[PDB]
Design a protein around this ligand. Structure first.
Ligand SMILES: [K+]
Ligand SMILES: [K+]
Ligand SMILES: [K+]
Ligand SMILES: [K+]
Ligand SMILES: [K+]
Ligand SMILES: [K+]
Ligand SMILES: [K+]
Ligand SMILES: [K+]
Ligand SMILES: [K+]
Ligand SMILES: [K+]
Ligand SMILES: [K+]
Ligand SMILES: [K+]
Ligand SMILES: [K+]
Ligand SMILES: [K+]
Ligand SMILES: [K+]
Ligand SMILES: [K+]
Ligand SMILES: [K+]
Ligand SMILES: [K+]
Ligand SMILES: [Mg+2]
Ligand SMILES: [Mg+2]
Ligand SMILES: [Mg+2]
Ligand SMILES: [Mg+2]
Ligand SMILES: [Mg+2]
Ligand SMILES: [Mg+2]
Ligand SMILES: [Mg+2]
Ligand SMILES: [Mg+2]
Ligand SMILES: [Mg+2]
Ligand SMILES: [Mg+2]
Ligand SMILES: [Mg+2]
Ligand SMILES: [Mg+2]
Ligand SMILES: [Mg+2]
Ligand SMILES: [Mg+2]
Ligand SMILES: [Mg+2]
Ligand SMILES: [Mg+2]
Ligand SMILES: [Mg+2]
Ligand SMILES: [Mg+2]
Ligand SMILES: [Mg+2]
Ligand SMILES: [Mg+2]
Ligand SMILES: [Mg+2]
Ligand SMILES: [Mg+2]
Ligand SMILES: [Mg+2]
Ligand SMILES: [Mg+2]
Ligand SMILES: [Mg+2]
Ligand SMILES: [Mg+2]
Ligand SMILES: [Mg+2]
Ligand SMILES: [Mg+2]
Ligand SMILES: [Mg+2]
Ligand SMILES: [Mg+2]
Ligand SMILES: [Mg+2]
Ligand SMILES: [Mg+2]
Ligand SMILES: [Mg+2]
Ligand SMILES: [Mg+2]
Ligand SMILES: [Mg+2]
Ligand SMILES: [Mg+2]
Ligand SMILES: [Mg+2]
Ligand SMILES: [Mg+2]
Ligand SMILES: [Mg+2]
Lengths: 117, 144, 64, 201
RNA sequence: UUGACUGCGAGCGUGACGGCGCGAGCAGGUGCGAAAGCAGGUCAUAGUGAUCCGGUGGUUCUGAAUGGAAGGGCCAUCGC
RNA sequence: GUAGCGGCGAGCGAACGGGGAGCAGCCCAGAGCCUGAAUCAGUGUGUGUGUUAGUGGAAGCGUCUGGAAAGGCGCGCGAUACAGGGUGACAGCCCCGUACACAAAAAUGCACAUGCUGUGAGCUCGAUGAGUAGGGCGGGACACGUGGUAUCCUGUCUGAAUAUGGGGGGACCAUCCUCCAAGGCUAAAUACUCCUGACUGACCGAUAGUGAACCAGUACCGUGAGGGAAAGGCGAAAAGAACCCCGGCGAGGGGAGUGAAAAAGAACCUGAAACCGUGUACGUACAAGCAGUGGGAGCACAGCUGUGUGACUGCGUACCUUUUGUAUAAUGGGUCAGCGACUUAUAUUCUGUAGCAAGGUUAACCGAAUAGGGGAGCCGAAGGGAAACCGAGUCUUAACU
């Protein structure tokens, strides 16, 4: 029962090379190189699902800080004020409101200031 | 019941280990041999008894005893075997015919093992004290 | 082919009922005058092979 | 236990141990596999590095050439080299305990009866050794793929069945586990049933 | 004066193992002591070497047709 | 894998006895008798029966698809033949076969029958293997390494008795049992396959399988012995491309034509990958690093989503191996494709599973039998003791609390 490997080996190589589309030079052409590239791409993607949550929160905070300071209060005091006021809106939404509805954002700032006053 | 509806019992057929077929298998690369040394090598491994050069156990202990030739031609008969002979006369030859003792056995002892219900005449064999009691209790007799 | 007994081991070990092995003690061949009688008397009877050693003995005596 | 005849519409008393036992799939499986293993011829080989034709000359010196070290043109690593673990002719036959063989047969026969695949008849014969006759007879009985087990191997019946690929004609002594399962229907003559009983006690 | 005893030993210590160590008490026979008792070497911890082969003495074992014997075993002990 | 042998190490490893296959006994060391008688042999002739060429050998049409039918569908027929091969696709019925039945002028094998020649059986009376057995010395073979070591062989030196005798029974002696050396022949069961025929394969399918599917032990290499490749596939059929055109009366190409198909056109089935191009979209000439990943505009495009691209930006030093530890400036890899490493046999132990169960199971072999026979054996149901031996006990001890 001799088994030839061609058909199965071809399929496996092709699967890796399809995942390496768009990569530079040997990385999209040559199986040895592409296999390493696709593994590394997978490792980064795993890491980056975690980092993505950090990068967005960091962005929301920076934006909230800008808008809060336009309304005469720092991020740190603003968040403290909202907590004392029992407002439970999250940073994603605050950052959204800071950009799109500045009047509503000012209302939140006033709410926060009152809770500190 | 068709040739393509028969199945082995669950657990009866375990797949063998296949070494050196990749990471996922759990037996890839070194194939369960670990790293380097004599035991990792093809044909590697030390002989039976070898303890690294320390005098092996079977050499640091003394030989003892001798082998009896008489023991080889001596057998023991259970009470349970007395019923398996033909005629109800247990002698050396009837025990052989009944495949109880080997062809080259010259001496045989009946021992207290199992039970004897029927009466049997034991002739020519040695019989233990306990076996003598059992045979006589069952109505048998022991001839010397 | 059939496994071969280590013939030297078969002259030193004998299998007992529960499947252990008995052996004779070392240190009673000679230089006996200097040894205490108590020491010698305790070396006379056969002893059982220890747990650590059984594996080795069993390997040597496949037909024991 | 009674087996209803087809032609005579009588009854036939048979052993319940033989024809009425439970189906032991694991047992039957082992015996069927063993039977197929027994059919294997096992005739093949390849050449090891010892058997490939060529000299024992070292292709190039151990050191200095910048090449991987080589010992033999016949190494299994090389094109045209030996097969690492070259096959030899093998015997694939397995032992089947006598009692497991008989146990399997009883399971199979009992299962045929439960599935109404066993048909008992008083007689089964053809006048002349003519395939046409046997073909007609089976068409009358609404049979097609059938194993026919007679007591005495009728030579006429044997010759009439030779060219019918779906039909097989055995004597009671020559029944085998795989055949019993392989065919859609099994027709046994009353005589054969008696013989099979005696054969399986 | 010969307990530097003979047969044993509940139990325990210490070793990977081979081993090494402590031990009341039991049987036999002994010494000392009026007796209770004590004694299986020495205040204790070094003073040593496995197995194989061989030697010497003993032995209610074995003894290659049988009776013996040789040789083997077992117990004691020795040698390089 | 026992008894043994064995730096009692590594290892080596019987026999007795049992079950089977097969079976067969004879002659010379010598004359008489018998007579050419058993018997085989040689050489003829017969009769069967092989082999070496051969002969006959059943039964199908319609319609649909297709380049082509043997395919689909419908309705038939043969089968002691549905093994197999071929035929424009995968055919019981088109062809060659197959089952089955027949066949030899000539040569020849084998088995029987029978002429002839040679052959001496049978009976009687004898005879009964000497530089031999044995021994000393040195070696060797026996499972046995000289050991307490029997038996066998003999290079060397010796040397019996001879049936009232002699050999062997594992030192040796006695007794008993058993056999008769120093002369020879002998079928079968057993071993093997350069070679011939037939058939078979959970054997390979062109880097496999023979080194060799092919004009291969060739080309080629070597003074020589010797070493030793690569290399298969157009199509059903050559119908293998008339003729025209560019070109050097080229190569190569474009038409035409053939064909089901010529991106089947001979560098010919399929026709992957590396590698190299042409075209289109998007990006890219102020920009620093494993080249991705997360975020992300813009542009192009197809139905707000999809697809391609990816300015800018967070994070981010390949893989394997070896190591206390490797981005390591330690190892290995130019890339792709193909191949390339825990197997097989037997024994042994444990686990799972199945059968049977104080039993379980057969080996060789017989059997046409994967059946059935075959229980020779093996393992288990009893141990203790070095052993004799005793035995649910036994050993130790004078004896055990
Ligand atoms: K596993
Ligand atoms: K392992
Ligand atoms: K080749
Ligand atoms: K048939
Ligand atoms: K048709
Ligand atoms: K086709
Ligand atoms: K055909
Ligand atoms: K001589
Ligand atoms: K070659
Ligand atoms: K083509
Ligand atoms: K980036
Ligand atoms: K490496
Ligand atoms: K290193
Ligand atoms: K280096
Ligand atoms: K290769
Ligand atoms: K196993
Ligand atoms: K099992
Ligand atoms: K006891
Ligand atoms: Mg294949
Ligand atoms: Mg692991
Ligand atoms: Mg390694
Ligand atoms: Mg290491
Ligand atoms: Mg290791
Ligand atoms: Mg090696
Ligand atoms: Mg040393
Ligand atoms: Mg027997
Ligand atoms: Mg001693
Ligand atoms: Mg050489
Ligand atoms: Mg090859
Ligand atoms: Mg059988
Ligand atoms: Mg003192
Ligand atoms: Mg004797
Ligand atoms: Mg003798
Ligand atoms: Mg025809
Ligand atoms: Mg075609
Ligand atoms: Mg002689
Ligand atoms: Mg001589
Ligand atoms: Mg001699
Ligand atoms: Mg000599
Ligand atoms: Mg002699
Ligand atoms: Mg190919
Ligand atoms: Mg080839
Ligand atoms: Mg041209
Ligand atoms: Mg077509
Ligand atoms: Mg084709
Ligand atoms: Mg092509
Ligand atoms: Mg391509
Ligand atoms: Mg720029
Ligand atoms: Mg740069
Ligand atoms: Mg970075
Ligand atoms: Mg280092
Ligand atoms: Mg690092
Ligand atoms: Mg560098
Ligand atoms: Mg490096
Ligand atoms: Mg290195
Ligand atoms: Mg390199
Ligand atoms: Mg016993």
């Amino acid at each position: 029962a001799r088994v030839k490997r061609g058909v199965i080996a071809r399929a496996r190589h092709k699967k890796i090379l399809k995942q390496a589309k768009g990569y530079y030079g040997a990385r999209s052409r040559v199986y040895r190189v592409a296999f390493q590239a696709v593994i590394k791409a997978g490792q980064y993607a795993y890491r980056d699902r975690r980092q993505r949550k950090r990068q967005f929160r960091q962005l929301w905070i920076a934006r909230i800080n800008a808008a809060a300071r336009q309304n005469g209060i720092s991020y740190s005091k603003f968040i403290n004020g909202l907590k004392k006021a029992s407002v439970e809106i999250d940073r994603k939404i605050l950052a959204d409101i800071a950009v799109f509805d500045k009047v509503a954002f000012t209302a939140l700032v006033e709410k926060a200031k009152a809770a500190l006053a | 019941m068709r040739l393509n509806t028969l199945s082995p019992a669950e657990g009866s057929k375990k797949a063998g280990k296949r070494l050196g077929r990749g990471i996922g298998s759990g037996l890839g690369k070194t194939g369960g041999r670990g790293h380097k040394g004599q035991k990792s090598r093809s044909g590697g491994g030390v002989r039976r008894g070898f303890e690294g050069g320390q005098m092996p156990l079977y050499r640091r202990l003394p030989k003892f005893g001798f082998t009896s030739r008489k023991a080889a031609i001596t057998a023991e008969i259970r009470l349970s075997d007395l019923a398996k002979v033909e005629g109800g006369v247990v002698d050396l030859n009837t025990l052989k015919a009944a495949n109880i003792i080997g062809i080259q056995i010259e001496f045989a002892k009946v021992i207290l093992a199992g039970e004897v219900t029927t009466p049997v005449t034991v002739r020519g064999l040695r019989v233990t004290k306990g076996a003598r009691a059992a045979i006589e209790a069952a109505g048998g007799k022991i001839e010397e | 082919p059939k496994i071969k007994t280590v013939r030297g081991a078969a002259k030193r070990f004998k299998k007992t009922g529960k499947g252990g092995f008995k052996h004779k003690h070392a240190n009673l061949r000679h230089i006996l005058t200097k040894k205490a009688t108590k020491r010698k008397r305790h070396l006379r009877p056969k002893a059982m092979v220890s747990k650590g050693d059984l594996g080795l003995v069993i390997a040597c005596l496949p037909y024991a | 236990m009674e087996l209803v005849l087809k032609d005579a519409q009588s009854a036939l008393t048979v052993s319940e141990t033989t024809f009425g036992r439970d189906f032991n799939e694991a047992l039957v499986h082992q015996v069927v596999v063993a039977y197929a293993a027994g059919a294997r011829q096992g005739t093949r080989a390849q050449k090891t590095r010892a058997e490939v034709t060529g000299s024992g000359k070292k292709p190039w010196r151990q050191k200095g050439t910048g090449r991987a070290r080589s010992g033999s043109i016949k190494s299994p690593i090389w094109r045209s080299g030996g097969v690492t673990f070259a096959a030899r002719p093998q015997d694939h036959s397995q032992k089947v305990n006598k009692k497991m063989y008989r146990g399997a047969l009883k399971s199979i026969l009992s299962e045929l009866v439960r599935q109404d695949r066993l048909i008992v008849v008083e007689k089964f014969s053809v006048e002349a050794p003519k395939t046409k006759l046997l073909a007609q007879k089976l068409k009358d009985m609404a049979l097609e793929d059938v194993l026919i087990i007679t007591g005495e191997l009728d030579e006429n019946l044997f010759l009439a069945a030779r060219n019918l690929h779906k039909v097989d004609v055995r004597d009671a002594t020559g029944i085998d586990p795989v055949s019993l399962i392989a065919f859609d229907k099994v027709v046994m003559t009353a005589d054969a049933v008696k013989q099979v009983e005696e054969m399986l006690a």
